[PDB]
Structure formats: structure tokens, C-alpha cells
Amino acid sequence: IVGGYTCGANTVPYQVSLNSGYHFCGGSLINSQWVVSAAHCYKSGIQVRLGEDNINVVEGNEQFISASKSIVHPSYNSETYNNDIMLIKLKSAASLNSRVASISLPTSCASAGTQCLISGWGNTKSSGTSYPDVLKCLKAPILSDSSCKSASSFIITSNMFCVGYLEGGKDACQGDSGGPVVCSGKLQGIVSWGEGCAQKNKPGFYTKVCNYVSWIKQTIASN
Ligand SMILES: [Ca+2]
Description:
Elements: E1 5-6, E2 15-19, E3 23-31, E4 34-37, E5 47-50, E6 63-72, E7 86-90, E8 115-120, E9 136-141, H1 147-150, E10 160-163, E11 180-183, E12 186-199, E13 202-208, H2 213-221
Antiparallel strand pairs: 1-9, 2-3, 2-5, 3-4, 4-7, 5-6, 6-7, 8-9, 8-11, 10-13, 11-12, 12-13
PDB class: hydrolase/hydrolase inhibitor
Keywords: Trypsin-like serine protease, hydrolase, HYDROLASE-HYDROLASE INHIBITOR complex
Assembly: monomeric
């Protein structure tokens, strides 16, 4: 995350890391057996990692559970990132506690201006590579739908909101993808894409979970 701060060991207990020999995408724990993340993060043989803060050191509190199944949205579009959502079932239920807890799904969509908390172990620089050891946080507001679009070269659909800072400097970035956007204690979004990171007039775009609650609840029940 570019222009953020250190969250602090387990201050974001719903945040998960998806690992395939090394961290590559983020995720959010929505119940003891299911994580939600981005469609575009799909990989086979994913190891979900709960309770992490320093991803490169074993601190105790870590839980490493394998993905028994990974269900991508059937309408995912890999070229426009529309319906960038994926549900991962854990092979065994996670041991829920103070440092590894689930986040509620939303009951209604969040309106422009609401302040949200974005997080992950992604890149922290506008130019170049600097992957942090510890979990990073950014507080940012939802921008108005008109704002994202004036400021855009790529297709934006109704399943995406956008959040951040048009001035630039503060944004999610590569490696945060699939991570959480929490607003008022509810997971409203999934880190999906942006035109680079932290660039002037190019905010971040996020899957709009509020559109997907039926599909999540239903997929979970029948799997
Ligand atoms: Ca660790």
C-alpha cells in the first residue's frame, strides 16, 4: 500500500495472505471456513495464511490452511476485471480468536464520502519495488461515481466503486489485490485494479461486494 502506515500486529484480524511459495494476493476472512478475494488472483494450490503481521517471520499466532476449493465468479471478465470476486474454502476450519476473526458482509452499499480502511502487503512505492514485511494500512474515502470516470482510461462498470485521493500519493497497489476495503465495520470492497498506483487523478478501483451478497451466501451454503 502506497502512502499508508504500519497497521500494527493483528489490528486487522480479518486480513489474510494468499501464498504460493511466497505472498502474492490478499484476502478477507468472512467466516471460519471461507475467504473472499479477487477473481484475478486465481491460482491453483493456494495456501491461505491467517494471523500474519510480519509475513517473512514466524511470530506464533500464524495459521496456515490450504484451499480445498477456489470458486471464481462465473461472469469474471479478465480483460475488464468486471466481477473480480473469488471465494476460497479452507480445507479445515480456522481457529477463530482475537488475532484471527471474521468480517461481516454488508447489508447495503456505502455512499460516496464514507471513510474506509484498505490494507495489505503490497508495494509501497509509486516508482519501483518495496514489499513490506509488516501489514500496511490506508484510510481513504469512496469517491463519487462521476469522479472515477472523468479520471479514467479503462472501462468502469456498476460492480466497481473507487476510493482514494485524486491528488495522488495514497493508494493500494500491486500485491494488495484481493484484500479488504472495510467501511463502518463492513467489508464493502475487494482491491481490484488501478491505473498504476498513487498517480495524480487515477484512483484505485474495488469490487463492489454489496452487489455480491446473495451470490456469496448462496455459493457458501451449496458448497
Ligand atoms: Ca509471520
